[PDB]
Amino acid sequence: KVKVLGDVIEV
Amino acid sequence: KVKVLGDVIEV
Amino acid sequence: KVKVLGDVIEV
Amino acid sequence: KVKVLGDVIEV
Amino acid sequence: KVKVLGDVIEV
Amino acid sequence: KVKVLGDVIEV
Prior knowledge:
It is classed as protein fibril. Keywords: amyloid oligomer, beta cylindrin, protein fibril. The assembly is hexameric. Chains A, B, C, D, E, F are Alpha-crystallin B chain. 6 copies of one chain form a homohexamer. By secondary structure, chain A is mainly beta. Chain A is 0% helix and 82% strand. Chain A contains no helices and 1 strand. Strand 1 (2-10) of chain E pairs antiparallel with strand 1 of chain F, so a sheet runs across the interface.
């Protein structure tokens, strides 16, 4: 399964 | 910290 | 198209 | 609630 | 490399 | 604004 792991940033 | 967990979906 | 649907959590 | 919507991009 | 670029929304 | 940056991972 293709999962996603990510971060939140302010741009 | 804020982390993103998710799925890839074909659309 | 590969799209992403995810959640934000605190880790 | 906070939900993430996005795209997969080849990099 | 498959990267992800996305947005956070309230649902 | 809040933007998500991340990776696709095989799980």
